[PDB]
Design a protein around this ligand. Structure first.
Ligand code: SF4
Ligand SMILES: [Zn+2]
Ligand SMILES: [Zn+2]
Lengths: 138, 698
């Protein structure tokens, strides 16, 4: 929103809002251009976005069309889950129920990764994503 | 009459041979001509063979077809003395054919079906686990109620008085009588309806004779069946609708989760076929004509549940807010828009099956579903069905930056109009296609390609009683081309044009109806007319139809126009030729004996809907910049021609301005060109010769 776009310059619209407002994927915080240029030039620390402690990393930012914080994170989580599993047991033989059961397991693991669960099945899915990455190398 | 037997012999030869016939009828003389021939062709064959299916265009033609059928039964019970198997059903609207919202709700809107499904599921809740039913339920489906219609004619007004005296329900009688298959009278918005015609076609069970009544706006219903505007306020409804599903999934996963889990297994096994078969007497969902879509073997978000389906929908609506957040004028291909969607989110190619199952799921799951929230889901689901299939002929348009506040208006263009008229040829044979406001009728072999025969109106006699002149020179021949422009160029000429109307109405102050091609010309002179002598010494009171014409305002202006001519006063009916209420009732001196038309009817140009349909029909029939300015302008003028010809017993004078009317045709083409001041002395003779030649030709 216009009332919150930067922890230092939240309402720069009266002072001509000519810069963008980057959002870090490990922070999900509205950080403007001018303040963040001082940030990653002097080391990778955390942002003080309402007293945040998540360490911001240098570069690897993104422009957003504002899908809140959930659907902005769920779109990259579904895109990261669609590349590791790829089209395994889906259209390899014109399968339908076996393709739907394999896509329901990919959707429920993505729903478990989106909700966070309790970092147990997600850590098991992190091993399964490591299993989906090791099976794509052999 | 012998002229009525000419079209009746053609109707007796085409109903037993042809499958579709374009029969032209004269105005005000072809109503009971095909009415008696339809019951005679059945009596010549078998009376339980092909029943009569009537397709009007307005509710008035539905009401006018019921009183003529009473005259057909009175002519069959007095000239024969035998009471056969009666028929006739008044399939009208839902707010008019009701009893419960006229007592407690006191609302005559489109929410009468919401109290209908609340009483249908309320009677279902009272007969399963437990409000209850209503005033008169669980009795209208009896066999004695099924025999109240082949024995006595109770349709619409006769049935609404029957459901109050016998204490019955008008909804469950008519719905149980489509399966009986009588003489069904309905309008054009039900045969091409993507929520009603899927239920009508499963109860008539085909094998009947479709009577197309006033089939001249058939191309307009196919455009009106689709094209919904998304004027950004539905995004606020979809945002609040998405948060309601988050609370509903939180309410379903808090206690009674077995009702959603067993429904998830029922969707993973029985899918949508068993879901539609099990669901009875409940609120049906929405689809893009299931008899025309044709799709089976679906999947529920790839074997997922409602918690994963609402995540795709929340993924869907933000992309819709992303695409609407654009610059100004931008066109969109429905196939390329689906490709840009898959670059954002892989929603496959079948969201048509991902929504109709979830719409039926949330009705069974959420019992206290909100009205504005669930309707916001149906607006997205109807758009999701149209982007999945039916891409041929489809087009997505965006309204430009129009202040920009009112700029985010998204619209989809309909496909071919021949696709909606396609399944009525294989379902029914001998489809009688009749219209009294067509001149010529060669565009119907052209546009909408179907093999049919062409028959014109073979009835033209007594030209001394049908005065058909036209005005050319308006004293200087300057206001005729002045009204031709869309913008009101030179309002001083329009004040001179409005000065001629006071002179024209003061000549014959005996019923005046003035049509208009636009409401801008009505609002231009009403600001400072400076001429009320006809509104104080001739017509006195004023009956002007506004652009926002209310149904009560149109009803009050119609009754007072009948009260003006029945008191020796006369009134001026300032209506819009492109506006609502096309009328059709006359055959008396209470109607306007002289009908005035301001120039020729025009169409709203420089619009994206017109420019899309221009290039669409340019590839189809190559009728660019011809039929769009002439065939459309004729039918809007032919609605004014259908009111003057009120039979051979009543006279009437219809004048036409400008000079572009000579390039087109008209019903009974006997037209003489004269000036405006010249026709004032001609109409004074025509209002005295017709009063002397009425007793001479008898
Ligand atoms: S049963 Fe009939 S009268 Fe009663 S609420 Fe339903 S539609 Fe209305
Ligand atoms: Zn700042
Ligand atoms: Zn942070």
């Amino acid at each position: 929103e216009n009332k919150d776009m930067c922890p230092i310059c939240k309402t720069d619209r009266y002072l001509s809002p000519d810069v963008k407002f980057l959002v870090n994927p490990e922070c999900y915080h509205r950080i403007c251009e001018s303040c963040v240029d001082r940030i990653f030039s002097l080391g990778p620390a955390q942002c003080p976005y309402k007293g945040c402690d998540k360490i911001l990393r240098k570069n690897k930012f993104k422009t957003q069309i504002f899908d809140d914080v959930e659907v902005e994170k769920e779109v990259d989580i579904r895109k990261r889950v669609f590349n590791v599993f790829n089209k395994t047991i889906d259209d390899f033989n014109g399968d339908l129920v076996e393709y739907n059961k394999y896509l329901e397991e990919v959707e429920d693991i993505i729903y478990k990764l989106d909700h966070g669960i309790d970092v147990a099945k997600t850590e098991e899915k992190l091993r399964t994503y490591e299993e989906l990455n090791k099976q794509l190398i052999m | 009459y012998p002229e009525q037997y000419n079209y009746m012999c053609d109707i007796k030869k085409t109903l037993d041979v042809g499958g579709n016939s374009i029969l032209e009828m004269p105005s005000g003389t072809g109503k009971t001509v095909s009415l008696l021939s339809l019951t005679i062709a059945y009596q010549m064959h078998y009376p339980e063979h092909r029943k009569i299916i009537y397709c009007s265009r307005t509710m008035s033609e539905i009401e006018k077809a019921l009183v003529e059928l009473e005259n057909l039964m009175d002519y069959r019970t007095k000239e024969l003395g035998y009471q056969e198997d009666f028929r006739g059903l008044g399939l009208t609207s839902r707010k008019n054919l009701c009893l419960h919202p006229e007592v407690s709700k006191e609302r005559k809107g489109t929410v009468v079906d919401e109290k209908c499904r609340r009483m249908t599921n309320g009677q279902a809740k009272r007969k399963l686990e437990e409000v209850e039913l209503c005033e008169y339920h669980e009795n209208l489906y009896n066999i004695e109620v099924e025999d109240y219609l082949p024995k006595g004619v109770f349709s619409f007004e006769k049935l609404l008085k029957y459901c109050e005296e016998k204490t019955l329900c008008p909804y469950f009688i008519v719905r149980r009588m489509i399966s009986l298959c009588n003489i069904i009278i309905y309008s054009y918005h039900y045969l091409l309806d993507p929520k009603i015609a899927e239920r009508v076609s499963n109860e008539v069970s085909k094998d009947s004779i479709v009577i197309f009544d006033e089939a001249h706006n058939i191309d307009n219903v196919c455009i009106e069946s689709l094209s919904l505007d998304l004027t950004t306020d539905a995004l606020r409804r979809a945002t609040r609708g998405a948060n309601a599903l988050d609370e509903r999934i939180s309410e379903v996963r808090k206690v009674d989760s077995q009702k959603l889990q067993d429904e998830y297994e029922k969707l993973v096994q029985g899918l949508x076929x068993x879901x539609x078969x099990x669901x009875x007497x409940x609120x049906x969902x929405x689809x893009x004509x299931x008899x025309x879509x044709x799709x089976x073997x679906x999947x529920x978000x790839x074997x997922x549940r409602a918690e994963h389906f609402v995540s795709f929908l929340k993924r869907l609506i933000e992309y819709l807010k992303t695409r609407m957040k654009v610059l100004h004028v931008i066109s969109e291909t429905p196939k390329s828009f689906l490709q840009h969607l898959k670059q954002l989110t892989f929603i496959e190619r079948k969201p048509l099956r991902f929504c109709s199952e979830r719409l039926s799921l949330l009705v069974r799951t959420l019992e206290v579903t909100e009205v504005e929230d669930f309707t916001a889901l149906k607006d997205i689901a109807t758009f999701a069905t149209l982007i999945s299939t039916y891409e041929e002929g489809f087009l997505l348009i965006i309204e430009p930056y129009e202040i920009a506040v009112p700029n985010p208006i998204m619209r989809f263009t309909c496909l071919d109009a021949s696709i909606a008229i396609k399944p009525v040829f294989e379902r029914f044979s001998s489809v009688i296609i009749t219209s009294g406001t067509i001149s010529p009728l060669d565009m119907y072999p052209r546009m909408l390609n179907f093999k049919t025969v062409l028959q014109k109106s073979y009835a033209m006699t007594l030209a001394k009683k049908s005065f058909l002149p036209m005005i050319i020179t308006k004293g200087s021949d300057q206001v005729a081309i002045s009204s031709r422009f869309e913008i009101r160029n030179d309002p001083s000429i329009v004040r001179n044009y409005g000065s001629m109307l006071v002179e024209f109405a003061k000549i014959t102050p005996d019923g005046m109806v003035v049509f208009f091609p636009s409401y801008l010309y009505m609002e231009s002179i009403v600001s400072m007319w400076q001429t009320m002598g006809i509104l104080d010494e001739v017509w006195k009171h004023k009956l002007i139809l506004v652009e926002t014409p209310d149904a009560q305002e149109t009803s009050l202006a119609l009754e007072t126009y009948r009260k003006a001519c029945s008191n020796g006063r006369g009134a001026i009916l300032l209506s819009v030729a492109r506006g609502k209420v096309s009328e059709g009732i006359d055959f008396d001196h209470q109607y306007g004996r002289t009908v005035l038309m301001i120039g020729i009817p025009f169409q709203y140009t420089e619009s994206r809907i017109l420019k899309a349909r221009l290039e669409f029909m340019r590839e189809n029939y190559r009728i660019r910049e011809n039929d769009f300015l002439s065939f459309d302008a004729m039918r809007h003028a032919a609605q004014c021609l259908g009111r003057v010809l009120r039979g051979k017993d009543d006279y009437g004078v219809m004048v036409l301005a400008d000079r572009r009317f000579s390039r087109k045709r008209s019903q009974l083409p006997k037209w003489i060109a004269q000036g405006l001041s010249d026709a004032d002395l001609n109409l004074s003779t025509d209002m005295a010769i017709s009063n002397t030649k009425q007793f001479l030709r008898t």
